[PDB]
Symmetry: D2
């Protein structure tokens, strides 16, 4: 054979390339010299293909992989065709159960490194030296939808990091919001059943907008705090690169002296916080259900590595009861104004997997996977999670040897007396499979706890109380965190929250459920309750109007760190700009546009009404990446329309809609020269409007203005104006 | 802690040692210098233990592996004990389904080499060069019983050989008898259900001696041939080393020119053919249910490598129809008087596994695993087998990636477009997972058939007929082969066959089934039928006495190759002798006895009425291996009683019974000096008798005479004398 | 073709008969009049056979269950033979993992009833009324050996009783000796690995008589008490009917007023205590490895119902 | 077998036939049906060979494949007529 093109254009360059420049490829082929200990240790299972013969799994070369064996060329297929049956058998058995929750996820390899030794507060080996590099495997996910569902749904996001330390695997299994919906793990199946597709008909997918979810929420006020985050734009991240990560639970750090320090884990996105807007998010589930998976993969291939700062909120043991909420209640956050996040290290995701199924689908994370230097707490949600992941992985990954699946393997030594189990890979030579033993001189042997390389010993927390199935009274406060969150949002973030509740409750068929949810909102904030109620045709009662708001959180009436946008944190590197071309584009504009974008690490996509190419005014040939319909504004952060022959596209409905959609979704728009003709479709005054870049040509000042808008993410002042645009 | 004894007696020497001399151990520790390509390729998964810390599967060191985490030392166990939960979870999931048939099996590693190139008749790479060594993994088995059933049952034995060739895995999955019970694979479940434990109560284990088996046999005369073999001493082999091996089905060899030659595969035991006697075998299932497994392991540890000669019965395509029987009928053997076995190569089993579960229990053999140069035939039993193994292995070994389990992995290259499936180990980097493809230039690619390293192409056999569920009329003959077998046995072998049928039929509760089987036997041979009938208190009718015997098989009235013992082929190396000691043994006898045995590679076990040591007449300290009851005569091939203080053991019931049992089971017995006092125990005349070695001491010809008897295996002439004897 | 004898001697009489008098049979056919609430509740899944056509699992009648479909009577088997493939597929997937421990066991149905109300010490409904019967299902077992190992080995015996009570299933999962070898569950895998067949060669089956068991015992003196019981004749019962049963652990009884009482459960064999002697037991593993299973089944068919207090 | 966990997926309620189904197949993971047949094989005399085979016929008969004519060599070849 020789089916590849003679020019070699089927194979992507093995160098960092911007989104759309090359076909995407398996990590080890795209970036073969991006290495870490874990990636190198997977080399024993990586399989090539070039220049090898096609064989059965038994190593028998196949001569004809196009036909079954039959009696005559139009005859019946024969049972002795072992090549066909092995091939079909393997195909028939490719699927495994998806994760019970967080089935939809996108993962990548990277590395973590501390900023300084944390030996004063923890003996965790991976935090002991700034020069200790820990390989990591991170999986980002939604929660409700199946593995085949869409990425930009409204949902909580999972953020799971597997740290391959020298003293064991440590999995930090968190989310993108700092609290969970429920307090005790016993109600997990109830909550998850309520949010998941309803049981009779299995609708709806990737949505909490249905009766059962809001039924549960209305009957369980502990849920309201996370519900507030989900209803805000936090529920629709722009990308996994632009969301925060939280471990949620209070855990413990244990140092060499044995002192325990309470800790809550945080991931700060170094690309900053950024979320979509609901219409854009929902439309994006239809135009590209793989948007976040794609964005992560392409950012890594481009060298726009997702970077996160690990941060710790540290609370002395003696300060356990100094807050007006319980530190062990997972529905309560620890305001950063009260307890600041200490910056501890940075994680860089710099390499995509080779095989999604092998490495992403089969990865198994567990919050119970801790190492010496870390310990749990009595958080009743965390307590129940400890049992659950162990249990689900024995059926999901087919047996108790899932730690032998390459991606899950520790990079440090593991030796014990455990044996057998389905698909046992390790062949143990130990004469003994029990301890104590004399026949192998008791090896492998226990190791006392110690400052480094010591065995695991639980912090000796004092336990006193009766065996009870009882919620702590300290957890029975449900409205002050939701109120604190609400008051910390900007006015437009508040408006998006109102709209989130309003949209979701509008899809709840039983009107009494919406009414019960509005009543709960009245216990949080009257303005919030009224705005939602007005959108639902609901009138608050006299009593609802008089519900006294919950108390502030330890004197706080707001905390700007809870807002996505209150404190500027924008980053344009890795963002993408749509450039709407015409058949005789002003080549001087493109040059200035592209040069300015490239200086800020901002990508561009050249769009037209057909594929192929257009020729600029000076003969510069411009290759078209996609059509106006083919790559909608939903996939970009800003839109630039350069000068040239605008009559080519001024009557293009798709071109006009591109701008109306971007406008509606608060995206920066830049119009050069005769591209100002488009001002009429989005009804922009002659004298202009903040958020619309316009000039005689696209020189350097024009580009600076557009890049300034992009750093602020969206044009929030345009909100009141989008009402009157039919898009 | 440091529990091993300071003299290092807990660890067996890494050198060949006779059975019982040292504790047995994992193959790689016992014989680290014994290597082969496959054994070397398993190094990546072998796990050590010495000097390593005890950890969880995630690599976390464990400090206290003696206790669960609890609230208070007398308190309740806590759910956060992740160490306890991983350890119990792995334990809980240790078992996998046992094989549906042949669950009880023992295996070992070895190597094969052909005597000469067979390129003229087959292009199979492993048979192309005398200097080409092919690693093998062989598993011997019983058929009916579970994995925890006994070894020395009366049953067919499985003999499966996995050849790790350069062009693919070839599995030769045979039995120890040259025919099978049924003709068509569609009846496999019927036959197997009939022989296995009956469904209401799951009795009996490891036995065909029950109603349903004999019910099925009585209604399906095709089974009679293999039933004759099972009722003979063939069904109770001395060892896996002393039984023949057969592929049963007629397969094809394909040469480079495309010529097909019919072939039946044979394994000749280089240690000769040898079987137990029923009473011994049955009692041995009680005294040592792991006798064959143990014997194999210890032979290999001693350096008594099981060796087998691969041989081929070759039949030209033109002679397909030249016999009285159909070549494709698996209930018919090909008499070696008609078609000789041509010697092909030698297989040596020289290393035990490291871990029984990992290597033995998970090994997967398939008769459909053939390589270029071999092909199938239309044998209807073979045809159905091709489907079955593939299918059963998906549930037994948890998915479609069982070829990735270390023992099953090819040592040659394997590449294809198959992906995923439970427990997927290989991480594919191929951009393509389909063919034809241009994105990876169509690799891996198909390979045309050719003389060497070519793709597999089925022999173009002509097929002509209608789609029918019909047994070929050529297969409808059921008694001539059984008769040929019967007539080829010695008189004592015939008696053992009669005794096997009689015993088994006595366990059939419904008398009419016994009568029906007797009627079938009367179609085979009147002498056989009459002898069995007499033992069952059944009288043959006049019509039964007049059933004309079936015709000879192609003019043959007997074939001595079908007998275990007609043609002497005795080999004493690896056999064992019990030495019954006394408290003042004649040291001179011991010296002569032990050195003579050692010179011929015959092992010995020094037995006494207690453990510890005995002191010979000259001060020699003699370590006792076992007591008379601890290691019964069932486990040895011969018994020697040296001179000394015989009154020490003369009135010892066990010592006397030891000889009665060994005498009853036709084993050579040698008595020196005053040990001749034991002659009255077994009723030996003053003059002596053939099969009893006796003299004033064990000096001159005493050992040579004993070894001559051992070479003949058992003293068949003693059969009439054991008739009485209460033992 | 292949039909029953004319005399009808192929079928066991459906009345109590002594061991060996009739071929043994499924319980519902041997004793159709013996019922209890649980036995009756299993009627939804019991399947008969007499007078019904042989079919695939999809209900398609089979015409020829003796042959595979082939092209010509001496030809290759065809892939379209769906009858053969369903039949072989089901056969190929018959086995399920045996129990990790107590894989060898024999079971029977029965009933329990208290002698008097125990309401003063426990609110458990199955012990509240002497005339309130609770169906049981009991499994007796060995511990070490696989499902196909022998019955009369030297080992501890398991005695598990499932009580189908009106307020839920209550399982009393005990043994035939009143203590266990170890103290903490965390060491269960260590102990069980030590007593099971050794990992390199998987020997020996159904026996503690090997180095790793005694090695562990020698290093863990807490095991000595149950070792004493195992080495005594308790380790080789004559029948499941002639051994004691014990829950081993202290559990609690809770009455309606909330009072807790510590309790240890016992089963007293009404057939008395009886064991084999070692030589006999060991030889019996060879002559009849299914001795206990057979003996239990035949006692029940004979009307010698195993009774325990 | 893998999607539905074993060979007894026909006992899953939605998959169950509404007509009679009787055969000698036994066991398998999650076996619901409790067979009372003394025999789990055929031919058998202990249950008078029930359940029994049924000859093909106009109605309620056993399945018999149409006796289509098969002629040709064992090949892995696409028919030219499909090209
Ligand atoms: C603070 C609250 C929780 C957080 C932050 C959290 C986070 C996560 C994440 C990120 C994943 C997906 C990991 C991956 O990418 O594979 C996950 C999966 C899962 N979660 Fe949790 N979860 C929480 C609560 C719970 C609770 C209370 C339970 C049950 C008691 C639970 C049970 C599971 C299970 C069974 C899975 C599937 C794991 C697998 O199949 O490998 N989660 N969770
Ligand atoms: C000539 C007749 C046959 C011979 C010589 C034979 C030989 C064997 C042997 C030696 C084994 C065990 C291999 C091992 O040690 O793992 C085995 C297993 C097995 N046999 Fe065959 N067999 C025969 C007929 C059949 C038939 C007709 C079928 C079904 C159509 C069948 C289905 C099986 C299955 C399902 C297993 C279990 C394999 C596994 O679990 O890996 N056998 N057979
Ligand atoms: C007082 C101590 C114990 C007693 C009396 C006991 C009793 C039993 C019995 C009678 C059975 C068999 C039930 C049946 O017939 O199916 C059994 C099975 C089992 N035992 Fe326990 N056992 C004890 C300790 C333990 C411990 C400490 C563990 C683990 C921590 C354990 C784990 C198991 C398991 C996993 C099974 C298999 C159950 C199944 O597959 O259904 N046993 N035990």
């Amino acid at each position: 054979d020789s089916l590849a093109p003679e020019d070699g254009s089927h194979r992507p360059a093995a160098e960092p390339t911007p989104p759309g420049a090359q076909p995407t490829a398996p990590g080890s082929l795209k970036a073969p010299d991006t290495r870490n200990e874990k990636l190198n240790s997977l080399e024993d299972v990586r399989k090539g293909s070039e220049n090898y013969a096609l064989t059965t799994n038994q190593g028998v070369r196949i001569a004809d992989d196009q036909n079954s064996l039959r009696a005559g060329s139009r005859g019946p297929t024969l049972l002795e065709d072992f090549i066909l049956r092995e091939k079909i058998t393997h195909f028939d058995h490719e699927r495994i159960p998806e994760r019970i929750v967080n089935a939809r996820g996108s993962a990548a390899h990277g590395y973590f490194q501390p900023y300084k030794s944390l030996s004063d507060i923890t003996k965790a080996d991976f935090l002991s030296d700034p020069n200790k590099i820990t390989p990591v495997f991170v999986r980002f996910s939604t929660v409700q939808g199946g593995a085949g569902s869409a990425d930009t749904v409204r949902d909580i996001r999972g953020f799971a990091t597997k740290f391959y330390t020298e003293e064991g695997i440590f999995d930090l299994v968190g989310n993108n919001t700092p609290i969970f919906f429920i307090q005790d793990a016993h109600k997990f199946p109830d909550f998850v059943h309520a949010v998941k597709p309803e049981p009779h008909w299995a609708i709806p997918q990737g949505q909490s907008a249905h009766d059962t979810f809001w039924d549960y929420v209305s009957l369980q006020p502990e849920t309201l705090h996370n519900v507030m985050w989900a209803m805000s734009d936090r529920g629709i991240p722009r990308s996994y690169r632009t969301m925060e990560g939280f471990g949620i639970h209070t855990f413990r750090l244990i140092n060499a002296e044995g002192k325990a320090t309470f800790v809550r884990f945080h991931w700060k996105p170094l690309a900053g916080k950024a979320s979509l807007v609901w219409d854009e998010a929902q439309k994006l589930t239809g135009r590209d259900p793989d948007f976040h998976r794609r964005e992560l993969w392409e950012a890594i291939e481009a060298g726009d590595f997702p970077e996160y700062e690990l941060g710790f909120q540290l609370i002395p043991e003696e300060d356990e009861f100094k807050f007006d909420f319980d530190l062990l209640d997972p529905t309560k956050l620890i305001p950063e104004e009260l307890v600041p996040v200490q910056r501890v290290g940075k994680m860089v995701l710099n390499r995509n997997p080779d095989n999604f199924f092998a490495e992403n689908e089969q990865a198994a994370f567990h919050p119970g996977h801790i190492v010496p230097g870390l310990d749990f707490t009595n958080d009743p949600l965390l307590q129940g999670r400890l049992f659950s992941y162990t249990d689900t992985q024995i059926s999901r990954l087919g047996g108790p040897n899932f730690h032998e699946i390459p991606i899950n393997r520790p990079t440090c030594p593991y030796h014990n007396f455990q044996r057998d189990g389905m698909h046992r890979m390790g062949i143990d030579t130990n004469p003994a499979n029990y301890e104590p033993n004399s026949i192998n001189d008791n090896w492998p042997r226990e190791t006392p706890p110690g400052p480094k390389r010591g065995g695991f010993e639980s912090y000796q927390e004092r336990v006193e109380g009766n065996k009870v199935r009882e919620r702590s009274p300290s957890f029975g406060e449900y409205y002050s965190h939701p109120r604190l969150f609400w008051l910390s949002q900007t006015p437009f973030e508040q408006r998006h929250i109102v709209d989130g509740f309003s949209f979701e409750l509008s899809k709840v068929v039983r009107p009494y459920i919406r009414e019960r949810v509005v009543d709960q909102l009245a216990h949080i904030d009257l303005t919030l309750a009224q705005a939602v109620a007005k959108n639902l045709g609901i009138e608050l009662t006299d009593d609802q109007l008089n519900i006294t708001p919950p108390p502030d959180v330890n004197g706080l009436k707001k905390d700007p760190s809870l807002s996505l946008y209150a404190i500027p944190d924008g980053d344009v590197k890795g963002r993408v700009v749509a450039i709407l071309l015409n058949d005789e584009v002003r080549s001087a504009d493109l040059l200035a546009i592209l040069k300015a974008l490239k200086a800020k690490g901002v990508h561009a996509k050249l769009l037209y009404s057909r594929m192929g190419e257009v020729t600029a005014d000076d003969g510069t040939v411009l290759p078209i990446a996609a059509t106006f319909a083919g790559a909608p504004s939903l996939t970009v952060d800003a839109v630039i329309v350069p000068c040239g022959n605008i009559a080519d596209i001024a009557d293009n409905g798709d071109a006009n809609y591109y701008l109306m959609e971007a406008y509606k979704h608060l995206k920066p728009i830049a119009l050069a020269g005769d591209a100002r003709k488009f001002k009429a479709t989005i009804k922009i005054a002659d004298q202009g409007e903040e958020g619309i870049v316009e000039a005689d040509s696209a020189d350097g000042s024009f580009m600076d203005e557009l890049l300034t808008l992009m750093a602020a993410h969206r044009v929030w002042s345009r909100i009141p104006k989008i009402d009157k645009i039919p898009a």
